[PDB]
Amino acid sequence: KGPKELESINASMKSDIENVRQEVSSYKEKWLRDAEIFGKITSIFKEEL
Amino acid sequence: KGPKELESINASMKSDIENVRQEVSSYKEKWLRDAEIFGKITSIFKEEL
Amino acid sequence: WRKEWDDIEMLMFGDDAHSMKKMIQKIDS
Numbered sequence: 001k002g003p004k005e006l007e008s009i010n011a012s013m014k015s016d017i018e019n020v021r022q023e024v025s026s027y028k029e030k031w032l033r034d035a036e037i038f039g040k041i042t043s044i045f046k047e048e049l
Numbered sequence: 050k051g052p053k054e055l056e057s058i059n060a061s062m063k064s065d066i067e068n069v070r071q072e073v074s075s076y077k078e079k080w081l082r083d084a085e086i087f088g089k090i091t092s093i094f095k096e097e098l
Numbered sequence: 099w100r101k102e103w104d105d106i107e108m109l110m111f112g113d114d115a116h117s118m119k120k121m122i123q124k125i126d127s
Binding site (some may be wrong): 037040041044045048 | 096
């Protein structure tokens with residue numbers, strides 16, 4: 001492949017790696033807040049079960 | 050159908066209608082159990098509010 | 099009877115939710 005072509009794909013792939021880290025962290029945090037509220041409600045009902 | 054035959058089934062058909070009334074009572078009991086389940090569902094509903 | 103089955107399903111939904119809480123404790127690690 002042309003080195004200019006290789007440089008362009010390498011640069012893109014780097015940027016894609018970056019967007020991914022941020023997206024994963026945000027998804028994990030939102031999921032965790034929702035999960036904590038869900039778990040408190042799940043606790044009293046779980047004791048009832 | 051023979052009237053004797055009809056009289057015999059109507060004894061049994063009336064019995065089946067009584068069984069259906071008993072089943073309706075059972076469904077009401079099931080609804081009451083569902084309502085107890087709904088009262089435990091009530092703590093979850095308070096968390097949701 | 100279908101309504102009673104749905105109540106049973108909501109209870110089992112609660113069990114699923116408890117399993118989900120255990121799983122969340124697990125993506126916590």
